[PDB]
């Protein structure tokens, strides 16, 4: 019983889509530093790639995550996920995302300048093929699915990372 890399999901205080949080003893045990990329394994064999931060109100065996990640992981509060470091992870050459058209009227107009540039610029966000993420944009949030990454199947969107969006 007991394992150090299996943890119980818990609601996050940080709503940033790329962030998960652990106690400091936990990070120190798993030998992780703030900014480190982790692979999370959830239910229905869904996997996510996150940035891990230290939270001091976090129980040594809890993991706080926003629901964008929980949803990507197909888990809910109190479920159990597996966490591993992701050292080999690389800066992305290209990424292909498609925006989710949920509404009549679709969405306009330049998704790149309005959503993607502002969302990705800054953060060196880690992403995976098949992630669904939500950008709080002008007028309305928009969701995108990650169609693919080069390199596949996951990577860090860097400032020189090419980002193609369907209609663009
Ligand atoms: Cl592409
Ligand atoms: Co293309």
Swiss-Prot record:
It is found in: Cytoplasm, Cytosol; Endoplasmic reticulum; Nucleus; Cytoplasm, Stress granule. Phosphorylated by tyrosine kinases in response to T-cell antigen receptor activation. Phosphorylated in mitotic cells. One of its GO terms (biological process) is positive regulation of protein K63-linked deubiquitination. The modification Phosphoserine is found at residue 18. Signal peptide: none annotated. GO terms for molecular function: ADP binding; ATP binding; ATP hydrolysis activity; BAT3 complex binding; deubiquitinase activator activity; identical protein binding; K48-linked polyubiquitin modification-dependent protein binding; lipid binding. It comes from the Eukaryota. Changing residue 34 to A: Minor effect on affinity for ATP and ADP. Keywords: Acetylation, Amyotrophic lateral sclerosis, ATP-binding, Autophagy, Charcot-Marie-Tooth disease, Cytoplasm, Disease variant, DNA damage, DNA repair, Endoplasmic reticulum, Hydrolase, Isopeptide bond, Lipid-binding, Methylation, Neurodegeneration, Neuropathy, Nucleotide-binding, Nucleus, Phosphoprotein, Transport, Ubl conjugation, Ubl conjugation pathway. Changing residue 136 to S: In IBMPFD1; impaired autophagic function. One of its GO terms (cellular component) is endoplasmic reticulum membrane. Changing residue 160 to R: No effect on binding to DERL1. Its main location: cytoplasm. Belongs to the AAA ATPase family. The PIM (PUB-interaction motif) motif mediates interaction with the PUB domain of RNF31. Homohexamer. Forms a ring-shaped particle of 12.5 nm diameter, that displays 6-fold radial symmetry. Part of a ternary complex containing STX5A, NSFL1C and VCP. NSFL1C forms a homotrimer that binds to one end of a VCP homohexamer. The complex binds to membranes enriched in phosphatidylethanolamine-containing lipids and promotes Golgi membrane fusion. Binds to a heterodimer of NPLOC4 and UFD1, binding to this heterodimer inhibits Golgi-membrane fusion. Interaction with VCIP135 leads to dissociation of the complex via ATP hydrolysis by VCP. Necessary for the fragmentation of Golgi stacks during mitosis and for their reassembly after mitosis. Involved in the formation of the transitional endoplasmic reticulum (tER). The transfer of membranes from the endoplasmic reticulum to the Golgi apparatus occurs via 50-70 nm transition vesicles which derive from part-rough, part-smooth transitional elements of the endoplasmic reticulum (tER). Vesicle budding from the tER is an ATP-dependent process. It is linked to Inclusion body myopathy with early-onset Paget disease with or without frontotemporal dementia 1: An autosomal dominant disease characterized by disabling muscle weakness clinically resembling to limb girdle muscular dystrophy, osteolytic bone lesions consistent with Paget disease, and premature frontotemporal dementia. Clinical features show incomplete penetrance. This is Transitional endoplasmic reticulum ATPase. It comes from Homo sapiens (Human). The lineage of its organism: Eukaryota, Metazoa, Chordata, Craniata, Vertebrata. The gene is VCP. The chain holds residues 20 to 187 of 806 of the full protein.
């Amino acid at each position: 019983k007991n394992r150090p890399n299996r943890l119980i999901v818990d609601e996050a205080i940080n709503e940033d889509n790329s962030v998960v949080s652990l106690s400091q003893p936990k990070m120190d045990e798993l030998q992780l530093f703030r900014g480190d990329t982790v692979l999370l394994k959830g239910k229905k064999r869904r996997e996510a790639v996150c940035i891990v931060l230290s939270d001091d109100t976090c129980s040594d065996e809890k993991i706080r995550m926003n629901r964008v990640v929980r949803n990507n992981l197909r888990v809910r509060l109190g479920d159990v996920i597996s966490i591993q470091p992701c050292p080999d992870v690389k800066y992305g050459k290209r990424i292909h995302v498609l925006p989710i058209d949920d509404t009549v009227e679709g969405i306009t107009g330049n998704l790149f300048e309005v959503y993607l540039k502002p969302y990705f610029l800054e953060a060196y966000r880690p992403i995976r093929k098949g992630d669904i993420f939500l950008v709080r944009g002008g007028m309305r949030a928009v969701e995108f699915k990650v169609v693919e990454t080069d390199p596949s199947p996951y990577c860090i969107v860097a400032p020189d990372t090419v980002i193609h969006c369907e209609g663009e």
